[PDB]
């Protein structure tokens, strides 16, 4: 069955409006995937050790040592917003929907092709491509999620974002266990710290093979493969942001004195002595009821140690932070509430005609005011007693450990039973969409990498690979490296991701932040005279929501 | 029945999504109307003659002479976009709908109040307001459209645009017939032209009375009045604009030479001698097939005389133009394709805290490229024969009538059996919504004032008036002026205007013009520290549409 | 800590973890709030510090009251002024029923 | 309809005992509310800035700057224990109930 | 929540009360750097204003149907049902030192 | 049972500084507190509410 | 997804390492560090912690 197609290209996003303001978004994405023969046919256990870098005192954070199993299989990952929606669709969703529901996912492989390269070793010399009709492409869909979960978006290795531009999958590899020690130090530290990779703990070894745990399918041109329809189990993702802070929760103080003339100088006045006011407070000493002192239900947001690194059996790792805005606009603390920074290129944004190999990037800065501005933090001695005396105040300025560039905010953590928090907002187009939950007894309240964490079950991973096209000479009983015909494959991938949205309703007199084409962004949405493209990142939760 | 309310306030806009991308927009608008006793109780036939102005040679266009019947009735007009939608709703409609259908209209008057002013003529002296419970408000709804149609939007006299700000109706008046002569002249004209108002032609007299042709209703506090539901008969209004011109219709010439390197200098080249090309043309002489010479199906747009005034029995009037863009952006000809200019204030936009009495205004400039740029026009002698010789070219520069500031474009008119044209686009918020068709045997292809022209039938006009609150002294047999108690009324008006929209679909790779809040417009959508408001005009058909 | 005399580790300290057992805020008579609307964040807080009852999926809506504009015979929309209106005030009885 | 009342005053707390030691507390609260005309009829967007206080080094905690929308509406809030129970009821609940 | 600022209805059945003028937070960017009495220079105390992408002007008239009541009229809410966890009226005294 | 959290900690974000909330009860003798440490609430009111 | 190794070992030996083959400031990927352009195994983004 060579002369018949086995599939259809479809990259349309359908918006189906239902009853009561609910829409059913059907994002169709098709892509032509190009796939090469594995450079090797065996699994390799490789160690990566860049001690040359960590050898330099004060370079701990640049540690890359790990051990990974290198498989002869490739992963077809489509878990990233850019694969399903273009700037247009996205603007539609973000400007009018109030919440998003991830419903189901299904993919299929069709119109498979396998060619053989022949070196017409004459003159230049030449190269001749031919069809190997009876050759097969191997396909394995790990439904049971036996294999380790490895999101390609984490390393900008998902399918590309352009319907009219071929793409490729990524060689699949996964972490193996290993013990590693690396002691912190600074430029002036003495002696040689302790930078040792101890190896692997036998009680943590887990060598996985696809061949042994997932049925594999062989497809020839005539064949096709389709996944079933997987249904997610995730909480809805909101498309609105909160702006309220503790300072803006509840009943404002009653102004006894109101401005009588226009002018951004004419303020209103509470009109009551800060120690002669009524209200509630959690400060049993003073009688000062102040906007920064009065009681509030709980606490929106929280403080966590910044540029903290922790260490365990495998080595050091940065301490993650779940947090939004908190601070002026061109007045951040990227570190404090962890604004994510995305590095990618060409195939996932970055102008296409770009040269060199320096990735493009951006630091996403959410609209939700749930972050913190450390410099504003301070601490006072129980006696209160203002103006506070230097001996009774710890400030983001006073040093810690005699260190000049470290202070309590750095060590600080105000997470507790009163912490109100929100989930990570979606990041177009470089963000991951869904993520598999940790199989720990107690799970995390959220994941920092994706807004959708399928709990009870997630779509399995799809592995692809060109099956061994051997030559007439092959001897198992001789390490050699099995000479095999240079074969490559081309197939089309088609996926269908279904969402369920809820149309928003206005509730204020005033208009609202809406995504829109300007005379400034204009050319970020259209190709140029050479056909170069790029996909600029966009914000998602533009639109306020009352928090309390 | 004085202690019971007879109505409900509702100013919500409901968007109900149906099957197949059709939405049903229900715009609810409520308003508190304040109404005063008529200054007179009789109809007056008044003549307006500003000959003092037209006396000055060269001031013909400033002619205001007319005759009108002044009625003791007031008109409650709500026919203007600003009454039904706020910036928010409007942004929603304009950014996502592709077409609009005007479905039905219904209004109602409730919670009527009538008070009596008493001058406590003591010291300052004082004023005392009292309720005249048994007094009546007169209401007349001209269902049959017996009365002359008089759109208040034409003179910025519709109900106000703010739900939380009381409004008032306009004294109703209508044109009476009259013969008037005014001969054109210029500063240097000699003698005294001819500026004569001849009066009225008995065969054109039509004195209308509401009392004689429309049943009138008397409402006391306990009463209420509601219109039925009127259903319109109008063509759908489109919310997209065309950009194609004759120069961009059909198959472009095939470029034999394409640019080989980036750069807005590297052009492509047709590659064929303009007199050696194949194609069709309407120029039987030359063999020049040129982008400006090749044939096109018909003609988008048309040329019409600009700053033309015509005259008939009543006097002079400007010749109307139905036309869009046509020309660069900051490169118009406001006159040529008649861009409308709206003058209004306070109650219908204009910052509320504004002083003085100079109206606010703007000239609406549509996105549809259906206008003309005269300077580009020219005319050639039949022989063609280029480069064209001055003696065979009439240019927008050569004079006409020996006049230096007049040329053929000024006199020009290229309307014909091949003219393709579009209807007037909606103008928020100062634009009129629907308009009653002319009862002429042959009707106009469009109206320049509103996008919706109810043909077979339109909602009738609503007239309101305080009924005569007489005093104990009244003598019919004595002209006097009937002394009557100073009475005024307050009532609530509620209307419901139902539209039917169609959701748009993207069909291009590129994004699209969308309405949106900027750091520049921001404060045009929110009140200030004094509570001042204003409603900035917006465009409607932002979004391209293929014309051919 | 930080060479500061009035600051020490307890001040910076945080021992919250996967083994923390905790209770909710206790009711405070008579000045305490009774119920509170939950934060609409993806991940919510284990408790609210202000009330012992946090209605999650839904809470009673807020009740807003206001005297409607009692205008005088003189009112002109087209003039910022400040709309002179009759001095009016209102008195009404409120009755609520809270079932535990 | 001016000469007819439209409601009843009730500020009784009813304790209804059921089967298996469960009681159903019905707290009734009635109140006469007095309400004045708004000082203004428009919404105002006002900024509050007490820099004069935060200007003084070491006074960070006394920061009050914020922006609020001032509405011509009033809120009728009853969410606070004191509105529903008196010392007596409260003593009853607190001394004998184990959960609410 | 008005309880946050002691602005709920009053606590005495036999004493008239009043509601509170409703107001709500608007978005704004503000910087204030910590300092102590002996800090040098002038820290950084700046109110940058509002971020357009966080603006949300709410109006009651535009989002909630309003009712007009005259003496003859009355208004009643429906019965709202809460969804909250039970609140306990007992306290724990055990500490880690007294477990087991 | 219970946990330790930074006391008289202020954090900052887009809007400005705010005190870090604490969810905690007793812990310590009677006339032997640390009002700050486990955040005992303080209520200010008057006339109409006490 | 581990970084793609442009340079792989060609002979056995626990010394023969593979090499990413791209300048740490010339790589593509995502990061939560809005300042630098350094995408590093200890710097690149991860879902959570
Ligand atoms: Ca930040
Ligand atoms: Ca023009
Ligand atoms: Ca144009
Ligand atoms: Ca903000
Ligand atoms: Ca304590």
Swiss-Prot record, chains A, B:
It is found in: Virion; Host nucleus. The keyword Metal-binding applies. One of its GO terms (biological process) is virion attachment to host cell. Keywords: Capsid protein, Clathrin-mediated endocytosis of virus by host, Cytoplasmic inwards viral transport, Disulfide bond, Host nucleus, Host-virus interaction, Magnesium, Metal-binding, Microtubular inwards viral transport, T=1 icosahedral capsid protein, Viral attachment to host cell, Viral penetration into host cytoplasm, Viral penetration into host nucleus, Viral penetration via permeabilization of host membrane, Virion, Virus endocytosis by host, Virus entry into host cell. Interacts with host TFRC. Belongs to the parvoviridae capsid protein family. Capsid protein self-assembles to form an icosahedral capsid with a T=1 symmetry, about 22 nm in diameter, and consisting of 60 copies of two size variants of the capsid proteins, VP1 and VP2, which differ by the presence of an N-terminal extension in the minor protein VP1. The capsid encapsulates the genomic ssDNA. Capsid proteins are responsible for the attachment to host cell receptors. This attachment induces virion internalization predominantly through clathrin-dependent endocytosis. This is Capsid protein VP1. It comes from Feline panleukopenia virus (strain 193). The lineage of its organism: Viruses, Monodnaviria, Shotokuvirae, Cossaviricota, Quintoviricetes.
Curated annotation (Swiss-Prot), chain C:
It is found in: Virion; Host nucleus. Signal peptide: none annotated. It comes from the Viruses. Belongs to the parvoviridae capsid protein family. Capsid protein self-assembles to form an icosahedral capsid with a T=1 symmetry, about 22 nm in diameter, and consisting of 60 copies of two size variants of the capsid proteins, VP1 and VP2, which differ by the presence of an N-terminal extension in the minor protein VP1. The capsid encapsulates the genomic ssDNA. Capsid proteins are responsible for the attachment to host cell receptors. This attachment induces virion internalization predominantly through clathrin-dependent endocytosis. The N-terminus of VP1 is sequestered within the mature capsid. It contains a phospholipase A2-like region and nuclear localization signals that might be exposed by capsid modifications during virus entry. Interacts with host TFRC. The capsids of autonomous parvoviruses expose a proportion of VP2 N-terminus and part of that sequence can be cleaved of to form VP3. This is Capsid protein VP1. It comes from Feline panleukopenia virus (strain 193). The lineage of its organism: Viruses, Monodnaviria, Shotokuvirae, Cossaviricota, Quintoviricetes.
